[PDB]
């Protein structure tokens, strides 16, 4: 069967049939779409379909498929599958996995460049310190002194369950959250659990509105140590706009480097549930999510007051207007300190490329409209216009529990 | 079964039972999520009829008396005979009230309850549905006090008898294409235009020129009339502080009065019923303006306040949204018509939201639409999980009448 989707302000009208080779569920029905919800031991059972329908799809990638090779390499995962429950992904494997997990991942905007990921094999690693290290060398190299690369460190694949790689940070590098006597937070309120967990694991605290969080490392199923990323691996850039001079006298300052470390990649039925990835940012993240959400650092009364605009009446829109300056801000910090970022006109511009040139070689981009459209100037964007199709492939990022829920402790 | 939904930023959590009494389908399966895409006999007709009435004397605290169950059969004898029914004028109102209260893309649901229903199913005529039409936008207009109203016509039969309003909304401009290739006017309505034209309409040819109604009774062929100028409100937008800004000749009309629609009450189908409420800032400012398939004035704005418009980055577009948007507001508020703002808009869908689930088990809401197409993260709805799913009575969309009409 084959579906049509829309671009409403040009007309264009693509062709998906890649929605056919979807298998996991999406949460929707006949009689209910669940679109706009945030979140909605294997045997070898169902081990060897899974581990046989990936290496078909990455012989099809490598023009080798039925050849001896792939035919060999079925036969020898499937020994292993049976002798020893699991197997093991060769290198290129790996690799092909990682970016196909990315090249899937239906809420990400920046996916044309899915094809440049650095990936670190970092599987041969069995101790927090290892992780520690691995990690390290990942933002260095990602960083990159501004010029930023995307990359991946993948650590070693679930066993039994009882022996998880887990890094405990959401993202390598983010502000720590304090929680105060008076019901007021300090620094990042998205961090006040994490922060917590820290404090209690041992970290001192210096209780700042910018504090770098320490890595909270899990090897091996083992209880989780703090280490504390070298300062001069961290590349920061303070915030100023470029006709208000008052914007830097609020303080505020972003890191460079945005490395998601809490999600789990599945890779032929195989899953690797610490596996750090980094990118860079899009404007919006920081200067619209980070800044001006009321469950975050919530700035927009405080820029709206210095800007004098008329804060009795929502209709004077001056919500709106600080919103704008704030992220021409964000942009012109980063830009002027040779940082990557991208804007939101940029970045959604390229997407639509991304997903047509998909549409032709591919048969379909899976993408999710909640997530793609940015959280502001929404229909100013040319994705606001673009009808999606959302449907889960494999390889693939998941979502898994936060690991103080489920870790049981050693002492 | 029963659903979950949570709002991020206040952590409130609502439970969602009246999903299971959906009927009609999403688009999506569980293989496919389908929440972008725009547009996803007697024997059938007496369960859509039960189904209703019980909804109905259900509401009124009389389901199960002798009253329900004689309208029941009565209805029954009706469709037996007749093949169709007739709704007492007290169903017909909670029809509609309730096709607003269901409509899962409609951000102002807050004010479903207070809904003015003007029954014309004794119209005949084209001139008789243009007298109504009046009546109506004059009623809902009230010198700018707007009003929330609709107007029903008679409902389909053999469907070769359709009464329809040909228009998209009963007040639009003009869109006409250029010797040189652009457009002037909207150009949304270039095809409608050329229809009224062909149909005998003179067109003045300018960048804001109203609309006839083109007005089909009766399956007949449809007839152009010009809504009396009178009747027309319309606010020259200014802004409050760029002086500059009213030099743009831009201006807007006060009633937003949909006309293309079906309401379906109890499996009967209504395919003419304008309705009407009133604007929020967004939807003129935003998309009306700056769509680039509409007056798309972004280029004109940004260098009137000389903006750097080389690079993207400088969110030159961004700070011309704002404020032609600002305008838009400025210019209502201060004509005193009635608009809302965004914010104010989407405070008011998690109030309403908030007494829907409380007062009966949910709200379908369809998240795409609902959030606002400017700063969509600053306002609550942005943050809130909603469940979409298809209640009746409801309003459909159907297909453009010229494509249908046999002339
Ligand atoms: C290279 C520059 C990149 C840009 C500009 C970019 C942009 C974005 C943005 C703006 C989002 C939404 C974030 C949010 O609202 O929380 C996102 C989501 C995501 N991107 Fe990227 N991305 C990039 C690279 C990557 C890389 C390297 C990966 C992994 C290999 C990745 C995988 C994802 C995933 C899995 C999500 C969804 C996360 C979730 O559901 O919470 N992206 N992308
Ligand atoms: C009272 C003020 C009202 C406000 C502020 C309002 C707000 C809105 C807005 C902003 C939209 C999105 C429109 C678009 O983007 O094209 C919408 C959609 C809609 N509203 Fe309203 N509404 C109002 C009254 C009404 C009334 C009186 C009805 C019917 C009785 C109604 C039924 C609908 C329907 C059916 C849609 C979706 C139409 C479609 O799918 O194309 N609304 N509403
Ligand atoms: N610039 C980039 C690049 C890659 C990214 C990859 C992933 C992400 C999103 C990670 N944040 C999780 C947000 C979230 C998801 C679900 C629930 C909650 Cl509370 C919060 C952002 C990215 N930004
Ligand atoms: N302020 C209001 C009140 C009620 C409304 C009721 C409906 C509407 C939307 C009417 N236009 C339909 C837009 C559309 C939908 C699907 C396809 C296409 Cl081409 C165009 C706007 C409203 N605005
Ligand atoms: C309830 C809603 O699904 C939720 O707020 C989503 C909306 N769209 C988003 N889009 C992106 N990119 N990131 C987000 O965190 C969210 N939040
Ligand atoms: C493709 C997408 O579904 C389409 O552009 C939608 C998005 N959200 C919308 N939201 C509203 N209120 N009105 C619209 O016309 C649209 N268009
Ligand atoms: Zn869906």
């Given at each position: 069967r084959f579906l049509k989707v829309k671009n409403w302000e040009t007309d264009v009208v693509l062709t998906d049939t890649l929605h056919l080779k979807s298998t996991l569920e999406t949460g929707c029905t006949e009689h209910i779409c669940m679109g706009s919800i945030m979140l909605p031991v294997r045997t070898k059972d169902q081990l060897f379909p899974l581990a046989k329908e990936f290496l078909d799809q990455y012989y099809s990638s490598i023009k080798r498929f039925g050849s001896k090779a792939h035919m060999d390499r079925l036969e020898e995962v499937n020994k292993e599958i049976e002798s020893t429950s699991t197997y093991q992904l060769k290198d290129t494997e790996l690799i092909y996995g990682a970016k196909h997990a990315w090249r899937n991942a239906s809420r990400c905007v920046g996916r044309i460049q899915w094809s440049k990921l650095q990936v670190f094999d970092a599987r041969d690693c069995t101790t927090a310190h290892g992780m520690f290290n691995y990690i390290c060398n990942h933002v260095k190299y990602a960083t990159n002194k501004g010029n930023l690369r995307s990359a991946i460190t993948i650590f070693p694949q679930r066993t039994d369950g009882k022996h998880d790689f887990r890094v405990?940070?959401?993202?390598?590098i983010r502000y720590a959250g304090y929680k105060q006597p008076d019901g007021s937070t300090l620094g990042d309120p998205a961090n006040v659990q994490f922060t917590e967990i820290c404090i209690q694991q041992g970290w001192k605290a210096p209780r700042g509105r910018f504090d770098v969080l320490p890595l909270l490392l899990q090897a091996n199923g083992n209880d989780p140590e703090l280490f504390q990323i070298p300062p001069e691996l961290v590349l920061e850039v303070p915030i100023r706009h470029p006709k208000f001079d008052w914007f830097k006298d609020l303080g505020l300052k972003w890191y460079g480097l945005p490395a998601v470390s809490n999600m789990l990649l599945e890779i032929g039925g195989l899953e690797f549930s610490a596996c750090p990835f980094s990118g860079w940012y899009m404007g919006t993240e920081i200067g619209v999510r980070d800044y001006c959400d009321n469950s975050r650092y919530n700035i927009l009364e405080e820029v709206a007051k210095k800007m004098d605009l008329d804060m009795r009446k929502t209709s004077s829109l001056w919500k709106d207007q600080a919103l704008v300056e704030i992220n021409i801000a964000v942009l012109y910090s980063f830009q002027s300190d040779k940082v990557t970022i991208v804007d939101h006109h940029s970045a959604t511009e390229s997407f639509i490329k991304h997903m047509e040139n998909e549409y032709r070689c591919r048969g379909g981009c899976p993408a999710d409209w909640v997530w793609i459209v940015p959280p502001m100037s929404g229909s100013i964007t040319p994705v606001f216009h673009q009808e999606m199709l959302n449907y889960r492939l494999t390889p693939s990022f998941e979502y898994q529990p936060d690991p103080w829920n489920t870790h049981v402790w050693k002492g």
């Open positions: 405990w940070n959401s993202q390598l």
